[PDB]
Each structure stands twice: as C-alpha cells, then as structure tokens.
Amino acid sequence: CXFXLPGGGGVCXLXSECIX
C-alpha cells in the first residue's frame, strides 16, 4: 500500500497518481 505492489520508497503509484 498504497496502490502499487512493491514495498519501498520507489514503488508503483509513487505519489498522487496512486499511493498519495
């Protein structure tokens, strides 16, 4: 979480587009 499968700082949905 948020929206994005990876778990770290560089993740899918990095920022308002998804997570945020």
Swiss-Prot record:
Maturation of lantibiotics involves the enzymatic conversion of Thr, and Ser into dehydrated AA and the formation of thioether bonds with cysteine. The carboxy-terminal beta-methyllanthionine undergoes decarboxylation. This is followed by membrane translocation and cleavage of the modified precursor. There is a cross-link at residues 4-12, 13-18 (Beta-methyllanthionine (Thr-Cys)). The modification 2,3-didehydroalanine (Ser) is found at residue 16. There is a cross-link at residues 15-20 (S-(2-aminovinyl)-3-methyl-D-cysteine (Thr-Cys)). Coiled coil: none annotated. There is a cross-link at residues 1-2 (Beta-methyllanthionine (Cys-Thr)). Disulfide bonds: none annotated. Kills a number of Gram-positive bacteria. Acts at the level of cell wall biosynthesis by interfering with bacterial peptidoglycan biosynthesis. Specifically inhibits the conversion of the lipid II intermediate into polymeric nascent glycan strands by transglycosylation. May interact with the peptidoglycan precursor rather than with the enzyme. Belongs to the type B lantibiotic family. This is Lantibiotic mersacidin. It comes from Bacillus sp. (strain HIL-Y85/54728). The lineage of its organism: Bacteria, Bacillati, Bacillota, Bacilli, Bacillales. The chain holds residues 49 to 68 of 68 of the full protein.
